[PDB]
Amino acid sequence: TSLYEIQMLNYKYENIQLRNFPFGGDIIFVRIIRNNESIVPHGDTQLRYGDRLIVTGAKEYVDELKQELEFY
Amino acid sequence: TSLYEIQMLNYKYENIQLRNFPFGGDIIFVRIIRNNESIVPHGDTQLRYGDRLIVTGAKEYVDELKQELEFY
Numbered sequence: 844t845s846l847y848e849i850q851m852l853n854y855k856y857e858n859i860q861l862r863n864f865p866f867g868g869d870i871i872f873v874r875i876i877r878n879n880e881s882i883v884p885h886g887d888t889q890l891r892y893g894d895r896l897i898v899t900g901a902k903e904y905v906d907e908l909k910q911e912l913e914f915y
Numbered sequence: 916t917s918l919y920e921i922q923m924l925n926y927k928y929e930n931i932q933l934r935n936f937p938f939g940g941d942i943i944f945v946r947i948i949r950n951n952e953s954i955v956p957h958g959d960t961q962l963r964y965g966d967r968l969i970v971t972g973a974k975e976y977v978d979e980l981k982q983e984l985e986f987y
């Protein structure tokens with residue numbers, strides 16, 4: 844697996860832009876699936892509750908992000 | 916999510932960082948395979964001859980980039 848899906852269910856990250864984001868080891872956001880649309884994420888893209896995040900990275904770092912964003 | 920491989924075979928774009936690349940369309944480089952290693956691209960990553968760029972985005976622009984980078 845090189846593409847992982849994380850659900851953004853953490854209120855503390857609502858409206859945060861990717862350009863400010865706390866990247867673990869390092870990850871790329873491949874797509875954000877939001878309200879029937881798949882968006883190509885860039886610096887000014889903001890997270891929203893319920894986003895389906897498609898990410899790529901080493902599993903260790905993906906795991907941290909999954910924990911923080913989906914499991915809190 | 917579709918990913919496409921683009922060989923960086925055009926010396927003209929050699930050494931250009933992603934932060935300066937003249938993107939003409941909606942795209943993200945998801946990975947770059949270089950020296951048999953899969954790396955996670957950022958602003959400071961420089962294009963190198965022979966890079967295998969794994970990209971996602973508008974197919975229209977993927978085609979244009981392919982023209983620019985591996986037809987040249």
Ligand SMILES: Nc1ncnc2c1ncn2[C@@H]1O[C@@H]2COP(=O)(O)O[C@H]3[C@@H](O)[C@H](n4cnc5c(N)ncnc54)O[C@@H]3COP(=O)(O)O[C@H]2[C@H]1O
Nearest residue numbers: 861862871872884885886887933934943944945956957958
């Ligand atoms: N995988 C990739 N494919 C194509 N181009 C790439 C790229 N990774 C970086 N870049 C290009 O470099 C800028 C610089 O990147 P950086 O990593 O330094 O600085 C970034 C970054 O940490 C954050 N960001 C934007 N998109 C991101 C994404 N998909 N994943 C994670 N962070 C992202 O916003 C900062 C400013 O974003 P902005 O897009 O407005 O500005 C971008 C974009 O034009």
